[PDB]
Amino acid sequence: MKYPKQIRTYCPFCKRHTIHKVEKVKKRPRSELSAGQRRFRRKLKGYTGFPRPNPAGREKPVKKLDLRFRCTVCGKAHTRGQGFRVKKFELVE
Amino acid sequence: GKSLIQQRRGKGTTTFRAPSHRYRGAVRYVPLNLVQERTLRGVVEEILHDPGRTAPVAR
RNA sequence: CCGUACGGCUAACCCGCGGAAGCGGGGACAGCGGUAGGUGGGCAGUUUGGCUGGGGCGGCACACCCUCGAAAAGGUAUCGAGGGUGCCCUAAGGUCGGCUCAGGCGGGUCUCCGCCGUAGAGUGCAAGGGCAAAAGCCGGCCUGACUGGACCCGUAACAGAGGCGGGUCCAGCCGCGAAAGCGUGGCCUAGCGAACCCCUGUGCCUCCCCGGUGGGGGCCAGGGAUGACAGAAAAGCUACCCUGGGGAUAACAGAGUCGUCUCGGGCGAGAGCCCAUAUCGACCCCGAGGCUUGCUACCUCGCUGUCGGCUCUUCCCAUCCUGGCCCUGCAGCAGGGGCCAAGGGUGGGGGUGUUCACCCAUUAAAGGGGAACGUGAGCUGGGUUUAGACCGUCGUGAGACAGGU
RNA sequence: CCGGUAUGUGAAGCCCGGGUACAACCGGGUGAAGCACCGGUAAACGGCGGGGGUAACUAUAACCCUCUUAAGGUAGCGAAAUU
RNA sequence: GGGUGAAAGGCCAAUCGAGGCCGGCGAUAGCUGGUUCCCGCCGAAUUAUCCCCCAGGAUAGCCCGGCCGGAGGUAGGCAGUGGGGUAGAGCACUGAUUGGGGGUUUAGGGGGCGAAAGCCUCCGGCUCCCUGUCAAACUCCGAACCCACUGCCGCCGUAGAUGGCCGGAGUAGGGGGGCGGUGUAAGCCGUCACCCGAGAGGGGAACAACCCAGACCGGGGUUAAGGCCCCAAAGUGCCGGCUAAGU
RNA sequence: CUUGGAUCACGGGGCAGGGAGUUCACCCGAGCGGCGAGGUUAAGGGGGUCAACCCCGAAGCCGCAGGGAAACCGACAGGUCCGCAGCCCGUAGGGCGAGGGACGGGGUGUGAAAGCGCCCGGAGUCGCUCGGGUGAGACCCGAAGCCGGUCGAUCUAGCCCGG
RNA sequence: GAGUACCGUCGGUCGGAUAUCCGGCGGGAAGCUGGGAGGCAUCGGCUCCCAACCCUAAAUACGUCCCGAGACCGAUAGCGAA
RNA sequence: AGGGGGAACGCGGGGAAUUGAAACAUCUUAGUACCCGCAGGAAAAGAAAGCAAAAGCGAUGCCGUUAGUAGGGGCGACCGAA
Ligand SMILES: [Zn+2]
């Protein structure tokens, strides 16, 4: 499925239709200096069992699309509706 | 589960001990702070059967 | 300057001998302490779903859409009938303009002209519904598949709701169009998902007397998944088995029913040297009984749970012999088929736990059934369903077999 | 199960760089045992095949063609305590 | 969770697939059992959604007790404004279904005069005219009946309507009878809201739900269902006709 | 108990005595009572005829202002209408009308803003009793089993010593 | 007033959360021009205090006992035992 | 000099499971039952390297409140100070 590389949309900071580049969101991994991860680390310690659930191999056949739209006049990004599932996705002219 | 004979032998009960009170003594040579170079001389006097040696002993 | 791999030494430490003192051998390895990764049913704690004309194996009726069922408002179930979705599309999405389909007839040869044509075509994908100067095909310009927020309908009738879905609008920024007008994804009805946690975006609030830096917490929006789909992180044996309970639920006899079963009937095709009925009677149609087997699940889960045999008494007739009769394709001797008749009789043995079935020799003939599949406060105890053990198959294994001993 | 380990991966610690007026934190290097890899072992667990065609009346196939395995059940015994 | 075992899970003081004794311990259970005086007023439900839920719970519906507020409400009917696709009927669409006739010949396999894929047909097909049959998932038509609303009758209501607030429950196995789907049937699954459950009394010989009929106490009288030869209260009743089989 | 009991479903030989919704802590409501924009004391102290009685003690808790995650900001002791009771004029009806219902205006969060949500025009608190919910053994009885510490080999299993 | 304050790591425990207390292991100070605390770490300012040695009454908890009392039971009750 | 005894109260160590979460493993039960040691008529603590915040207090211990609060937690059931 084909989506453009640039689209003309409302920018709520400039408050008008500007041109926007389309970017996908790249997923990073958990941080260690967070509070939940700290909790987890101190609950794993010592003599225990395993204190949380561990679902191994749980996924959907297709996932949604994170998509950020970044203006050119100011360079700020924003979201444009909800997501939609498709298996293939390729950006074009 | 239950145990093995392997595992009960390691505790030292009459079912597993050796009856050494039935045997003739231990067999060692001589302590060598006594045998510097003196080359002791001795005489055999008896030959006997030991129930813990699979070999005869001699006095 | 920091480690190393290797050779060597003895003075720590381990071994031995010995009152001891020391002597010998090994040696910075080992052992001891602390930490890090692996292996690990040797030992533990637990899990191993539910619906289910019993249960298990099978399937999913365990999340959604359409037609029927469904009883001309609404609503309405079953392991009820018939089918589909767990996607695809920058166009198949918005608008503006122009034009009309499948099929056939008549020409021309193996896409060309004309005509009839209410849609018999097509619509991104099922079914149903909708649609013709179109909601279909041909094109031109765009990205309302947007932002901030209200209210209402459905799932879920009447009559409670989290999450999801749809609809009518206010404001902003925009597209198409001469204009009016339309446009908050796909003509309508399917294509998906809580809490906590994490990632991204944006711009603001906060961290223990004060003020700075680094790093942390919060509000708002989007996304990563739980298909048992209003969401546990998870395999099996028990015939050594225990408890608590159940006729809400099977095997066993009873009740109900009779497809199957046994015993019959109507009609007359045709066969019988010719002759429909001596005898046989098709194909089709109509029944009795409750002595087979099934279906259901109304009684009984500690009443008794049982098969066969022996002993003992009684009943039905749909009669095997014994008495009496009628038809014959009945010369006699006999046979075949039918009516009355239930007083009496219907036995002995071989292999098998057998019932039945098969076989022998006799006999007037050696009938079939019921009585809680009559009869264990009457016997026996061969079979079957405990605990022991063997074989064959299946299983990694514990183990199982409506398989044998 | 055993042996070998040239090579890959592989935890903590140590080393280098970045960041932090110090730390947390990020990245890389070194990198044992184990796994991966190469080999030996069945009086170790266990396993040891199909479809077709053919000889002087009929039968049968000593024989051949194929599909195929890590290897295709040998000697014996056989309706067996196994049919 | 240890011993011993020529191994049967065999023995360990009448106790062993993990002893006996006190303690944790008045362990837990959605499972079984029980729960103590009288009269009076009202009076149910076993069904929709969710739960590793199906012998159990929650949210609602159905009962009770109090109070607020303050004038309409509608379990019945008549007329009207609207909606609907059932029974029945029929072929105008979808699809099935007998046969005879025309007319054109062919999508195609049988042949001949096939002097050679044709001028001639086959037996099929295609268009019409008659004839004879169908529909739970068809409809050119189309009831009885059902629903919503408006107005009038009729009933309730100021001795307090529709309605609202606060509190206390029980119910999550239903069954007879009528209607529908499935099934050889028995039965299974639903629906209707009349009855049993939670309902005495009179009759059906006796009978949970079939007929009459809804019940404070003492007495009197007339009826219902049905009955009137004896049992057994009341007719060996009246007229007309049939049965000879104790039907 | 059950849809369903004279049941071939369970409990049921006779008499007498015993024998099952209790107590605490929090929460929701009511029937009464006291004070009232305020209400109420605890521990404790003093006095007495000394476990009864009397006086002091408001620390604290609830309430009088709400919104918002937070920083922070910070409201009507009545402007209009309809109108029950009751009162006035009367003779049916009409007027004022507390409490009750509906509008309007305001505070704050969210948002450019409009509009939406909560809130504002003075009634609460303190006690006795009762009904209920939650937790504690929680109306009464009933398990198989899980854990801890001690006792046992005069039975029976095995081994040693002496007969 | 030194294997002490402190720093990292492991185990336990706490309401103690990047911010409780105890212990093991490996490192480790200054010491009066000195040193510690102020709820993540660090810099500065301000405020409060001087650890790593010892003793100490009163107000408190109990009741195998005593005095004294009681909307307690009254011989199958009340303690198991009148 | 010690050694042994003593209901409950006391100081110091070791340390479960049933049960609840309608299963269960982190949690809960619980620093509980029970075990080991040491003291008394009371024991233990106790004289700031503290509390706090622009103001200040002045050793310990007990009651009433603070408060089911701050805060911990499959952020669940629940636990819980100064
Ligand atoms: Zn911009």
SS (H, E, C) chain B: CCCCHHHHHCCCCCCCCCCHHHCCCCCCCCCCCCCCCCCCCCCCCCEECCCCCCCCEEC
Check whether residue A50 has its CB closer than 7 Å to nucleic acid strand C: yes
- What was the experiment behind these coordinates? cryo-EM
Structure tokens at A32: 């260690």
Measuring from the CA of residue A31 to each C1' atom, give the nucleotide at the shortest distance.
C198
Is the C-alpha dihedral spanning A69, A70, A72, A74 positive or negative?
Answer: positive
Q: Report CA Rg, chain B.
A: 19
Return d(Cα B47, Cα B59) in angstroms, integer.
6
Residue with structure tokens 């749980």? A58
Return d(Cα A23, Cα A66) in angstroms, integer.
9
Q: Report CA Rg, chain A.
A: 20
Measuring from the CA of residue A12 to each C1' atom, give the nucleotide at the shortest distance.
C147
Instruction: Enumerate residues with CB within 5 Å of ligand 1 (an ion).
Output: A 11, 13-14, 71, 73-74
What resolution in Å is listed for this PDB structure? 3.0
- In eight-state DSSP terms, residue A20 is E
Distances (CA, A) of A39 to A46, A47, A55, B38: 14, 16, 19, 79
DSSP H or E stretch at residue A36 = helix A35-43
List bases in chain D with any atom under 7 Å of a protein Cβ: 24-26
Return d(Cα A85, Cα A82) in angstroms, integer.
10
A14 labeled part of a ligand binding site = yes
CA of A81 to C1' of C147 (A): 10
